[PDB]
Design a protein around this ligand. Structure first.
Ligand SMILES: *[C@@H]1O[C@H](CO)[C@@H](O[C@@H]2O[C@H](CO)[C@@H](O)[C@H](O[C@@H]3O[C@H](CO)[C@@H](O)[C@H](O)[C@@H]3O)[C@H]2NC(C)=O)[C@H](O)[C@H]1NC(C)=O
Ligand SMILES: *[C@@H]1O[C@H](CO)[C@@H](O[C@H]2O[C@H](CO)[C@@H](O[C@H]3O[C@H](CO)[C@@H](O)[C@H](O)[C@@H]3O)[C@H](O)[C@H]2NC(C)=O)[C@H](O)[C@H]1NC(C)=O
Ligand SMILES: *[C@@H]1O[C@H](CO)[C@@H](O[C@@H]2O[C@H](CO)[C@@H](O)[C@H](O)[C@H]2NC(C)=O)[C@H](O)[C@H]1NC(C)=O
Ligand SMILES: *[C@@H]1O[C@H](CO)[C@@H](O[C@@H]2O[C@H](CO)[C@@H](O)[C@H](O)[C@H]2NC(C)=O)[C@H](O)[C@H]1NC(C)=O
Ligand SMILES: CC(C)CCC[C@@H](C)[C@H]1CC[C@H]2[C@@H]3CC=C4C[C@@H](O)CC[C@]4(C)[C@H]3CC[C@]12C
Ligand SMILES: *[C@@H]1O[C@H](CO)[C@@H](O)[C@H](O)[C@H]1NC(C)=O
Ligand SMILES: *[C@@H]1O[C@H](CO)[C@@H](O)[C@H](O)[C@H]1NC(C)=O
Ligand SMILES: *[C@@H]1O[C@H](CO)[C@@H](O)[C@H](O)[C@H]1NC(C)=O
Ligand SMILES: *[C@@H]1O[C@H](CO)[C@@H](O)[C@H](O)[C@H]1NC(C)=O
Ligand SMILES: *[C@@H]1O[C@H](CO)[C@@H](O)[C@H](O)[C@H]1NC(C)=O
Ligand SMILES: *[C@@H]1O[C@H](CO)[C@@H](O)[C@H](O)[C@H]1NC(C)=O
Ligand SMILES: *[C@@H]1O[C@H](CO)[C@@H](O)[C@H](O)[C@H]1NC(C)=O
Ligand SMILES: *[C@@H]1O[C@H](CO)[C@@H](O)[C@H](O)[C@H]1NC(C)=O
Ligand SMILES: *[C@@H]1O[C@H](CO)[C@@H](O)[C@H](O)[C@H]1NC(C)=O
Length: 1194
């Protein structure tokens, strides 16, 4: 061996210098540019160097290689062979093996008069196996600001016919502008002229160059990426013979029942052609004695009753109302609530978002044509220049807003979050205008001279949607697109309406204004909401006819529900008035026209209304005293429920007295005591059954059911007591009044056999209980039960969180805009808890996504999830901090540089006096920082800023994501890896997203193998607390309904004696009511949520109020046969139960039908209507027939 050239003495043109000929042996290097040889081509560095090379040649290599490093450095094995062809081509130590100079001539020096020899031309021997593996490993790499191939800008022609030999000829040719002299390549693998060429090792785009540099992407290499992922779809229908499972299995249960049931009637019809009274008797005696006591002592009883009312109802001064949604819809000690508590303590709370979905309806799409060559690229309507100026005008106006509070201004600049503050203090605005940095100048600046423009905002937009984190364009524009706050703006967060990667076609512009949320501070939250109100008002009062804005503020759902929570008081007041009107007119039997206003019950009706409203106030006041806060659900379900139960008892008592004839020699207090003693066990049964039912129903962890259960239980109990003591006293007084002839309301101016009872005794009970009507009735009811049980498991789960908004609202428009345009959803944070190591080889392999780290690690699993993206609802890649930290700390990048004496961070833009690199540029230094070096360089990384010489830095993105626990060697605390969900439109989507995020977290926790259960991975998103209840709502429904029905069963089997048969008939009928309630639920499209479960547990308690009365009247009766007992029970009790609860509630719902609110009209009106008429129908048409057939003897 020998060298061929050294130095630069000649000059061609510009800075280009001809190499100076010298064919002696290779020189030991002067120790000056040792750093350069390890960056350009490290294959020569095994020191005792003896390289023929020169630092003035090396620095011109590095200067000319600027654009191939930028384009081709994405795929390391490609840029590795390119470096191997140049370093070796220029200054290899065995240069004479593969080179032979042909033409050379002398050069004259103006400095020393010694004539130097330039090298004008020569020939270069290149192997064929190097060029084929080189071109084939580099042909797939894409270019920046285009979808072309990167060879298309470096071959000198189209990328369809640049062969594996002509491209090398174009590179060595001076026609490009870089090569100082043309070199003629000759390609041959075999020795010619006895001289054999160079053939070193080659690596393709799939093989990695070193054990720490990850392989090439499949965007830039066609041999790494194989079959796509695919999930397995389970649909799960049984579908036996063509239609559903329960739909067919029930219809065969029905045909089997109807044939085995009516074939026994037509089979036999053609064949024939003491402990109870001991507890039920002491109660009767007690109520009779106490009833007489109350009629002959009215003053003491009414006084003590009023004192009780006042003492209990004085607790309304401490009334608190809960309106904050997390405490309402999320259990205080649930799993999701504990995860939210852990996240708010270590990383601070999730921010508040104010979006704005602007759209341009008048403008049409236009075409953009690149000047040199390239296919046409169409741009959507909002991406016109005029529309962008108007949106920029709108954004600068939203930043203006001041919104004074407590005589001081509270600006956007004060409340929004600027991640890297105070250095840069602007704040996060996520708008497509941040690519141009919110400046009319930068947006309006074009580069060129007439008849065509070289660059334009189309070119800038196209460059920055592909790579939004660059700090200079470096190709004909030379502008950054980082954004005024500093840190990237991702195109899927700021655009919508495009088609899957093609951001050119965008139809909407999304503009987000993140605002800080504060953890245990209330003054700041009042400041933030004070700004949001004015933001809402401004956007509503913004005219701009070219644009259609769909906006939202963080407090807007709460504001819409508090604005919607009025406008129906005009319906509820008229509802109660019409109810009271019926109570006053229907209680009194008319029986004559000249005696109307004396046998009238107006005063007694007023007394009934005051006892019911008074009961409401006593319930509210006792639980207000105790400290239980109210809710807006309670305020709509409590008057109605208490009205239902209380009014029915009032009718039972008053009509049971009116239809009673007074015995001879019996005075009034004895008669009223007798009637109360004979009617009171049934009322006691109903009231006690509901109180025990509701109170026992206060065991769930659901806040709506918990507070409702407490309030409703106390109200039913207090209302029963208040009736039993005060209403019989007022009833005695009103009988005294009517017997002393005195007229009604004004003052002092001086048996019944009611119209309903003559219909129920004479026409309805005999007809219904005939032998040709009972099989028809039983057939119809088992058929309706069969339908309801069949369509049971097709009921929806959850609430749409939209139908809860008015129809004239802007939030409905915002939800339409989301569903029609948006592509990203709420962010997910995968929090790895405190306790992980991070300063060890295995501890880093379990968490990384990169080269040496595992294939089942955390970052890799979220990446796989994002490759699926429809089964698992995680839309995008993770954005880890540990990969970035490793990329930052590696010696090649050279962002890291420490001060020599102070051990302080020397910045990337600094004058360079003596600060040296942190990690040594040796083979050991290439590796990951596994020891104590990790924790010595991590805070400096998290404090580094986005410098143009370094890259992105770790302050704007990871400062809140990494917690460092100072003192005792400084370990790492809890950290997160944040990605984004897919657009979620319905409750099914939200539950699916929750479930599968939990699944990924549980998977990672399994693979990590923790000794015991010291820590675990968990996902946090904002809606998890609101949607975690629906993962156990089915077992909650089972437990609540089963426990309430068992409580009813037990209370019935205790109070009725020990008769198990009456209890089983009553319980089976209320279970029928619940199953048919679910059928009507499915049929009207009501969904199962936290409102519907409350309404079902209420229906289970009104079902008793019908049943209990009828079944007790049948049971305690001493007639002969079942038919006469059924018609007797029907007549006697059903005349009062149809007039008391049914007609009142029916009048209420039919007047309530003009409601004007959607939430009310779906979950309250329909459920109440269903409950009332279903229970009425069931009781009065199904207890007679079922008791007639299989009722309990005595
Ligand atoms: C979403 O945006 C993409 C942006 O590429 C649209 O694709 C392209 O469609 C436009 C429609 O008018 C074509 O002009 C583009 O190019 C054509 O380019 C070839 C190049 O060989 C020429 O020979 C043709 O004469 C023509 O000019 C076309 N570009 C590519 C790369 O396919 C896409 O249509 C759009 N989607 C919708 C729904 O509008
Ligand atoms: C994730 O989201 C969807 C499934 O959840 C996919 O989308 C869909 O788009 C429509 C339905 O809106 C359907 O495609 C129809 O039109 C195409 C035209 O080529 C037909 O081939 C197809 O038979 C349908 O009539 C599909 O149901 C679905 N995608 C397709 C192929 O259009 C979406 O693609 C999916 N993405 C991924 C990566 O899973
Ligand atoms: C081309 O291949 C040769 C043959 O392997 C390489 O030469 C050796 O390089 C290693 C790397 O450090 C040295 O340890 C050996 O001592 C070298 N052997 C010799 C000179 O006989 C050479 O490095 C390759 N070219 C490049 C640029 O890597
Ligand atoms: C956002 O921060 C940037 C710098 O972090 C501020 O800077 C400049 O904006 C002015 C016009 O206001 C331009 O003339 C300069 O070119 C920018 N300076 C640099 C060095 O980039 C900017 O004012 C801040 N505010 C807004 C609203 O953009
Ligand atoms: C547009 C494309 C083709 C440009 C990429 C090729 C460039 C960067 C390459 C091709 C030929 C190379 C040159 C070949 C010869 C010499 C003389 C030597 O003493 C110093 C390096 C120097 C000056 C090289 C610098 C890099 C170089 C100019
Ligand atoms: C280039 O690579 C392709 C696969 O991408 C292969 O089919 C072809 O044979 C290769 N050509 C060579 C090595 O000349
Ligand atoms: C609104 O913002 C503009 C931005 O240039 C500023 O000049 C002006 O002072 C702001 N305040 C007003 C109008 O109160
Ligand atoms: C606002 O508060 C300050 C006290 O900080 C007080 O001096 C000032 O008079 C107040 N202004 C008004 C208009 O109330
Ligand atoms: C980005 O602009 C040019 C592009 O060639 C580059 O030379 C320059 O160094 C970069 N800017 C800074 C501040 O480093
Ligand atoms: C609406 O668009 C037209 C055309 O781009 C423009 O002239 C006008 O100023 C725009 N703005 C309005 C009406 O506020
Ligand atoms: C994942 O785990 C190891 C690491 O390479 C290996 O044994 C296993 O085959 C890998 N699985 C796949 C599918 O690559
Ligand atoms: C770089 O460091 C110097 C000195 O510490 C400091 O003045 C300068 O603001 C830093 N620049 C950044 C962080 O962009
Ligand atoms: C760093 O400090 C050591 C000893 O303090 C010294 O030997 C070395 O030359 C210094 N390097 C630089 C670049 O100042
Ligand atoms: C979690 O792991 C199980 C087996 O360990 C696998 O079936 C399931 O698909 C994984 N879930 C993911 C990757 O979301």
């Amino acid at each position: 061996q020998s060298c061929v050239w050294y130095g630069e003495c000649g000059i061609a043109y510009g800075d280009k210098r001809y190499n100076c000929e010298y064919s002696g042996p290779p020189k030991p290097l002067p120790k000056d540019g040792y750093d350069l040889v390890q960056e350009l081509c490290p294959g020569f560095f095994f020191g005792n160097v003896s390289l023929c090379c020169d630092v003035r040649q090396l620095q011109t290599l590095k200067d000319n290689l600027q654009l191939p490093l930028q384009f081709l450095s994405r795929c390391p094995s490609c840029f590795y062979n390119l470096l191997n062809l140049f370093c070796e081509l220029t200054c290899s130590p065995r240069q004479s093996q593969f080179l032979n100079v042909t033409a050379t001539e002398d050069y004259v020096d103006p400095v020393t008069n010694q004539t130097k020899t330039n090298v004008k031309e020569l020939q270069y021997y290149v192997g064929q196996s190097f060029a084929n593996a080189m071109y084939n490993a580099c042909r797939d790499v894409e270019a920046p600001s285009s979808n072309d191939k990167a060879l298309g800008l470096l071959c000198g022609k189209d990328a369809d016919a640049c062969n594996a030999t002509n491209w090398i000829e174009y590179m060595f040719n001076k026609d490009n502008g870089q090569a100082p002299f043309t070199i003629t390549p000759v390609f041959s693998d075999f020795p010619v002229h006895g001289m054999e060429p160079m053939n070193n090792a080659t690596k393709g785009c799939d093989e990695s160059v070193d054990e720490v540099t990850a392989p090439c992407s499949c965007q830039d290499c066609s041999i790494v990426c194989g079959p796509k992922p695919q999930p397995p779809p389970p649909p799960a229908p049984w579908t036996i013979l063509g239609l559903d499972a329960m739909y067919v299995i029930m219809w065969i249960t029905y045909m089997a029942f109807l044939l085995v049931f009516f074939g026994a009637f037509f089979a036999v019809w053609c064949y024939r052609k003491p402990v109870s009274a001991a507890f039920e008797g002491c109660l009767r005696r007690l109520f009779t004695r106490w009833g007489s006591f109350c009629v002959r002592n009215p003053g003491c009883v009414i006084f003590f009753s009023l004192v009780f009312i006042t003492a209990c109802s004085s607790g309304l001064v401490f009334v608190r109302v809960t309106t904050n949604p997390v405490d309402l819809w999320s259990a205080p000690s649930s799993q999701a609530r504990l995860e939210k508590e852990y996240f708010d303590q270590h990383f601070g709370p999730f921010f508040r978002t104010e979006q704005l979905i602007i759209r341009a309806p008048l403008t049409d799409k236009h075409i953009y044509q690149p000047y040199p060559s390239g296919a046409d690229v169409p741009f959507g309507p909002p991406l016109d220049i005029q529309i962008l100026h108007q949106v920029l005008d709108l954004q600068i106006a939203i930043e203006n807003i001041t919104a004074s509070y407590d005589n001081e201004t509270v600006t956007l600049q004060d409340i929004c979050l600027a991640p890297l503050s105070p250095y840069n203090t602007n704040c996060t605005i996520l708008s497509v205008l941040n690519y141009f940095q919110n400046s009319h100048s930068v947006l309006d600046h074009k580069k060129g001279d007439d008849f065509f423009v070289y660059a334009d905002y189309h070119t800038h937009f196209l460059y920055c949607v592909r790579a939004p984190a660059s700090l200079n364009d470096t190709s004909l524009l030379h502008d950054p697109c980082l954004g005024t706050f500093g840190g990237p703006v991702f195109p899927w967060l700021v655009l919508g309406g495009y088609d899957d990667q093609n951001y050119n076609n965008a139809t909407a512009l999304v503009i987000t204004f993140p605002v800080n949320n504060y953890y245990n501070d209330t003054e700041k939250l009042q400041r933030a909401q004070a700004w949001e109100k004015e933001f809402i008002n401004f956007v509503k009062n913004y005219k701009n006819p070219n644009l259609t804005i769909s906006f939202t503020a963080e407090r807007s759902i709460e504001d819409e529900l508090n604005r919607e929570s009025d406008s129906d008081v005009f319906t509820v007041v008229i509802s109660y008035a019409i109810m009271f009107l019926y109570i006053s007119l229907a209680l009194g039997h008319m029986k004559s026209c000249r005696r109307l206003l004396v046998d009238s019950k107006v005063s007694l009706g007023i007394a009934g209304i005051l006892i019911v409203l008074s009961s409401v106030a006593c319930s509210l006041g006792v639980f207000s005293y105790i400290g239980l806060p109210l809710t807006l659900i309670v305020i709509e379900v409590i008057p109605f429920l208490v009205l239902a139960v209380g009014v029915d008892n009032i009718f039972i008592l008053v009509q049971a007295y009116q239809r009673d004839e007074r015995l001879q020699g019996e005075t009034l207090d004895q008669q009223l005591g007798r009637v109360l003693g004979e009617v009171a066990p049934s009322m006691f049964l109903s009231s006690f059954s509901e109180t025990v039912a509701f109170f026992l129903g206060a065991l769930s962890v659901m806040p709506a059911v918990h507070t409702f259960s407490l309030f409703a239980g106390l109200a039913v109990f207090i209302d029963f007591l208040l009736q039993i003591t005060c209403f019989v006293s007022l009833l005695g007084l009103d009988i005294k009044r009517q017997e002393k002839n005195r007229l009604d309301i004004f003052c002092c101016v001086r048996a019944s056999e009611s119209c309903l009872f003559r219909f129920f005794k004479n026409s309805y009970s005999p007809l219904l209980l005939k032998d040709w009507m009972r099989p028809i009735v039983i057939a119809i009811f088992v058929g309706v039960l069969s339908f309801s049980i069949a369509v049971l498991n097709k009921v929806d789960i959850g609430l749409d969180q939209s139908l809860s908004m008015p129809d004239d609202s802007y939030m409905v428009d915002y939800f339409k805009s989301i569903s029609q345009y948006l592509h990203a959803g709420p962010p997910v944070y995968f929090v790895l808890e405190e306790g992980h190591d991070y300063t060890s080889s295995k501890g880093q392999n379990m968490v990384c996504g990169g080269m040496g780290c595992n294939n089942d690690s955390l970052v890799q699993q979220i990446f796989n999830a994002a490759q699926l993206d429809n089964y698992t609802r995680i839309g995008f890649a993770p954005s880890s901090w540990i990969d970035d930290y490793f990329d930052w700390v590696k010696p090649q990048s050279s962002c890291c540089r420490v001060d020599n004496i102070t051990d302080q961070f020397c910045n990337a833009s600094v004058v360079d006096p003596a600060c040296v690199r942190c990690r040594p540029l040796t083979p050991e230094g290439k590796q990951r920082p596994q020891g104590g070096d990790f924790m010595r360089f991590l805070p400096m990384f998290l404090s580094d800023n986005p410098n143009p010489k370094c890259g992105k830095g770790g302050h704007a993105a990871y400062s809140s994501a990494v917690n460092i626990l100072l003192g005792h060697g400084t370990r790492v605390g809890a950290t997160y890896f944040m990605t984004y969900h897919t657009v979620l439109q319905t409750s099914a989507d939200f539950i699916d997203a929750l479930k599968k995020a939990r699944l990924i977290a549980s998977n990672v926790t399994e693979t990590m193998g923790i000794n015991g259960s010291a820590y675990r991975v968990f996902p946090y998103s904002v809606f998890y607390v609101f949607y975690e209840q629906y993962l156990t709502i089915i077992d909650d429904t089972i437990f609540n309904l089963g426990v309430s029905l068992g409580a009813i069963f037990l209370v019935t089997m205790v109070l009725l004696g020990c008769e198990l048969w009456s209890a089983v008939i009553m319980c089976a009928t209320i279970a029928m009511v619940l199953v048919n309630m679910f059928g009507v639920m499915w049929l009207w499209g009501i969904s199962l949520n936290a409102v519907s479960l409350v309404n079902l547990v209420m229906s289970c308690g009104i079902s008793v109020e019908f049943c209990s009365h009828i079944t007790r009247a049948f049971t305690v009766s001493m007639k002969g046969s079942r038919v006469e007992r059924a018609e007797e029970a029907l007549a006697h009790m059903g005349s009062s139960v149809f007039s008391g609860i049914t007609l009142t509630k029916f009048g209420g719902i039919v007047v309530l039908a003009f409601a004007k609110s959607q939430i009310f009209q779906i979950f309250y009106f329909r459920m109440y209507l269903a409950m009332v008429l279903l229970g009425a129908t069931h009781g009065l048409i199904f207890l007679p027939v079922l008791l007639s057939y299989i009722g309990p003897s005595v």
